[PDB]
Structure 1
């Protein structure tokens, strides 16, 4: 399927067998989605990780993209802090695509999968936060989406009615994940690239805390880290 997805001249797929092959490759990824937790030590020059990160650039299925993101999420679990596949095999076309999925305001399973992949990618913190906040377009979409993902699908107190007369008490499913990711991102000490982001988001998140009081219990370690 990598030979199909890249377009290499070796083993070009015959189209008439394509319905024989298509449902052949949906039943294998669902095995790779299930056994990846038991391949939890990821090596450097791995073939599974390289193959799936080649596949993710090609496909257009929502289901298959969610399965690839869950496999790569649960494959880098008990990883390292120094040297595994995530430091080098993410060739920056892919990691610029996974953060891009946060802009899709309508879907919500893909946002949760992408935030979980970034969260499992960002647990070491030394060579991971700089690599994430390295690009001028990967470190800049997060300046706009992640304060907006706090009040995602939450009845904020509006003011259009108050301008035209003439509180939620809850959260959402992705607000908890975004608060978790941003509190974990606030722990980047020694003023590297992480707290340089976490200081430039506070004047905008401070307006979101005035509207939603469950953002006071959550966003606690971030507020202690400012």
Structure 2
């Protein structure tokens, strides 16, 4: 609650932490496919972000934690379609939705 209390501390994490999953990782681009006319790995901070977000998904009883963890799923779901090592990781979060 103290972390997700502020209007600017609980709001930077809505934008950075889904973006930190595919940090420095060769995602399958589509600019080439629009202009013709998979990574098999992760990074060093992707593991840490997946760990933090799986630990943040354990906030039960619908306090302030799962209120964040439900509003990040439609954006992380696009990141799981690109990187298959985000299927083994982000496991307890996916079980907690």
**Common fold by TM > 0.5:** yes
Q: Which of 44, 51, 55 in structure 2 is aligned with 1:180?
A: 51
Q: Which one has the bigger helix percentage?
A: 1
**Which of the residues 128, 131, 150 maps onto 2:2?**
131
The answer to whether structure 1 residue 197 and structure 2 residue 68 are counterparts is: yes
Q: Give the paired residue count.
A: 97
Q: Write out aligned runs for 1:110-129 (5 A).
A: none
Report which structure shows greater RCO (CA 8 Å, sep ≥6).
Answer: 2
Deviation at 1:170, TM superposition (A): 0.0
SS at match of 1:133: helix
Quote the offset at 1:184 in angstroms.
0.0
- 1-structure distance, mates of 2:35, 2:79: 23
**Secondary structure, aligned partner of 2:60:** coil
Q: C-alpha displacement at 1:155, in angstroms?
A: 0.0
RMSD value, Cα: 0.0
Please state how far the C-alpha of 1:139 moved relative to its aligned partner. Answer: 0.0
Query: Which of 80, 83, 89 is residue 209 of structure 1 equivalent to?
Result: 80
Q: Give CA deviations for 1:170-198 in whole Å, capped at 9, x if unaligned.
A: 00000000000000000000000000000
Instruction: Measure how far apart 1:168 and its partner are.
Output: 0.0
CA-to-aligned-CA distance 1:133-165 (integer Å, 9 cap, x gap): 000000000000000000000000000000000
Instruction: Provide runs of 4+ in structure 1 moved above 2 Å.
Output: none
Whole-angstrom CA distance in 1 between matches of 2:37 and 2:96: 43
1:217 to partner: Cα distance: 0.0
Residues 4-28 of structure 1: per-residue CA shift (max 9 Å, x gap): xxxxxxxxxxxxxxxxxxxxxxxxx
Secondary structure of 1:174's aligned partner: helix
CA–CA distance in 1 between the matches of 2:44 and 2:65? 24
Bigger CA radius of gyration: 1
Pairwise CA distance, 1:221: 0.0
- Please list every run of 5 or more consecutive structure 2 residues that lacks an aligned counterpart in the other structure: none
Deviations 1:10-60 (A, max 9, x none): xxxxxxxxxxxxxxxxxxxxxxxxxxxxxxxxxxxxxxxxxxxxxxxxxxx
Q: Deviations over 1:62-113 (max 9, x none)?
A: xxxxxxxxxxxxxxxxxxxxxxxxxxxxxxxxxxxxxxxxxxxxxxxxxxxx
